[PDB]
RNA sequence: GCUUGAGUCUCGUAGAGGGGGGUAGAAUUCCAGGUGUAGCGGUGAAAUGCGUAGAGAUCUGGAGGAAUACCGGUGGCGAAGGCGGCCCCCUGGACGAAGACUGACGCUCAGGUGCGAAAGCGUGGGGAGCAAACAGGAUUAGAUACCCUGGUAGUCCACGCCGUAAACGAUGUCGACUUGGAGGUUGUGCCCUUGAGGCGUGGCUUCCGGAGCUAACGCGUUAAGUCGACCGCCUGGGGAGUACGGCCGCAAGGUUAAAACUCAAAUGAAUUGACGGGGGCCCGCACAAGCGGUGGAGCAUGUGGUUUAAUUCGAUGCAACGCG
RNA sequence: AGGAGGUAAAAAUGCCAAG
């Protein structure tokens, strides 16, 4: 293993799922946990409740590095933001800053005209 | 959007990112240009707008609180 | 409620980013005229300062570069 | 209902030794009217399960409640569009009483000779935590765990 | 002749007005690579689809096309259609101040000519994202649909064509006159700009409302008020903006535009109801929480049906069926 | 006062009835 210190947890809060991926500063991944993985087919992945142990299961993912501060990013519209992020606070990790990296267009690509 | 405030962090309370947008600009443009509904519903939010300024200014009759 | 140039008078100049800075939120996004209570002739000047001082990189487009 | 808000009943207590919770149990043990049927199965077998606890009757009885004393339970709630289970806390005067019907009719299907013979096999092995109505403790615990997504 | 109408000049101001050429950042997709591990995606729920050939997630690098977040506002500009990043070049119109000038040059306009959303058509490009057609998956009695996964034409550019729209303030243009209030926006004068003020005066614009008008709804100095000039148009509904003919068009079609026959109505605004898979509030063993039943069995009894010489008549969703 | 949301915010199907 690598063992390093310090590393930034991604969050991709979508409106059907939650993928929390904990990587290092660079950007290379070290372990993930998704909504889906931890069970709840269904409806039941897009509840606040299985984000929380998506980011949970994904803490114990990466037991083998030793990460405690974590700088978190939280991208998308879903329930999970808020939730997957007090996770990984009780589940001892130092949150040195959080930011929302949620990709917003500066108007332009054409959006689908979906669901009447 | 970013947040620290770098000592005291205890709880998250991002009211920050709702100051900005947090769902706004993206539970808008999640799909539908439509093109010209923004140009109706545009104006009936300014019309219950100068409505409701037209009401609140029109309260004074007695109704017995 | 305040004001802007209709007394400290200007022909608003897109190089004084320190006036500028004022005028942008924390994401760098343009704050509106009903915010900050300048007049809509200068809204629409500083609107053109900013434009142009991202563009020559004195002004960040967003908060995320 | 709609309006009304009512306070509960005034139970009188057991006449054998003074206590609301088995006289609220010989009613749940009731059929017909028959109060007086039903205080003898009660009685002859908390006897011949105290004999076998070991414990007197009533501290006997009450840690058989907690083996099938539930404590989250599963509600049918619609708020958006289909409706879907919601596990909800039991409030407490609900939790033994609801406790104490899941015995009751585990005991009734049991295949033994008489009912007291039946409630006392139900109440022991409920304290050894064995039986069928601990069985219902357990499946109503499993769905709620298992739809723990909804609060 | 005259100067008020109309116009010209001087000086400024505001503006997504138009045409051309550059360029910017955000994002989507694709391509390549690093990390990394079993899902991702999607829905009311699913599946199709994508994924151990290693996706999705994350990071770096690139290539492309299209649109311009925030500003942004019943804000602005334009004859209307319309027009939003920034910068330059070319260019139209409007408005204001203070004067000067022309001297009725005006208004309207059939035919005519020009402009004219989107879709479409022609030729040549371009093609990220969306997406008719189409395909697959669902849903469903069926589902040629809504929903999902894909996806061609098209959307984009150049140059022609089409010439239509709920092209709508469903309100032709021009002029005059006739109480008010609150705003928005853009000029300008004066005074103590003494300070965001005070006082005026123009242009455009939103809302409310008086007289008046209107069938009523409503309009109400931006009139649907009071008048004048000119134009377009209407004459019961259906047949029908169809047929035929002409003209126009590459075509799709447009434009002009009937009749036979048929009905005694069609329609407008408002009113009281009822209803709504509209909204708010509330109630009832209405649901929920409970307990005991019925539906199975055997009888009792009533009805239907069938039968009979007759099976007397009546009661028939709730509110007939141990009912008269 | 306007703005944003909130276990929450919906959207599964649901045809017909004759003078």
């Known amino acids: 293993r690598k063992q390093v210190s310090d590393g930034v947890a991604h969050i991709h809060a979508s409106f059907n799922n939650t993928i929390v991926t904990i990587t290092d500063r660079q950007g290379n991944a070290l372990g993930w946990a998704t909504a889906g993985g931890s069970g709840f087919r269904g409806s039941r992945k897009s509840t606040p409740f299985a984000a929380q142990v998506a980011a949970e299961r994904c803490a114990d993912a990466v037991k083998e590095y030793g990460i405690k501060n974590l700088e978190v990013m939280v991208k998308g519209p879903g329930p999970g933001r808020e939730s997957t992020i007090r996770a990984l606070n009780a589940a001892g990790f130092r949150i040195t800053n959080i930011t929302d990296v949620t990709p917003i267009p500066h108007n332009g690509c054409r959006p689908p005209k979906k669901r009447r | 959007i970013k947040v620290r405030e770098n000592e005291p962090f205890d709880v998250a309370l991002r009211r920050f990112k709702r100051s900005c947008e947090k769902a706004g600009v993206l539970a808008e443009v999640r799909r539908r240009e439509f093109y010209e509904k923004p140009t109706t519903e545009r104006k009936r939010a300014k019309a219950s707008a100068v409505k409701r300024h037209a009401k609140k200014l029109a309260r004074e009759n007695a109704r017995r609180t | ?65 | 209902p709609r309006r009304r808000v009512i306070g509960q009943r005034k139970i009188l207590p057991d006449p054998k030794f003074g206590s609301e919770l088995l006289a609220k149990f010989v009613n749940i043990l009731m059929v017909d009217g028959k109060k007086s049927t039903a205080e003898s199965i009660v009685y002859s077998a908390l006897e011949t399960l105290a004999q076998r606890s070991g414990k007197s009757e009533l501290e006997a009885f009450e840690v058989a409640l907690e083996n099938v004393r539930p404590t989250v339970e599963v509600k049918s709630r619609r708020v958006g569009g289909s409706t879907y289970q919601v596990p909800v806390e039991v409030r407490p005067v609900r939790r033994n009483a609801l406790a104490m019907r899941w015995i009751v009719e585990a005991a009734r299907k049991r295949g033994d000779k008489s009912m007291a013979l039946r409630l006392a096999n139900e109440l022991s092995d409920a304290a050894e935590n064995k039986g069928t109505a601990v069985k219902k403790r357990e499946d109503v615990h499993r769905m709620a765990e298992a739809n723990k997504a909804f609060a």
């Open chain 3, 1 to 65: 409620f305040c004001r802007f140039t209709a007394e400290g008078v200007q022909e608003i100049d897109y190089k004084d980013i320190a006036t500028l800075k004022n005028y942008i939120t924390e994401s760098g996004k343009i704050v509106p005229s009903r915010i900050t209570g300048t007049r809509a002739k200068y809204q629409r000047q500083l609107a053109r300062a900013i434009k142009r001082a991202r563009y020559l990189s004195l002004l960040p487009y967003t908060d995320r570069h």
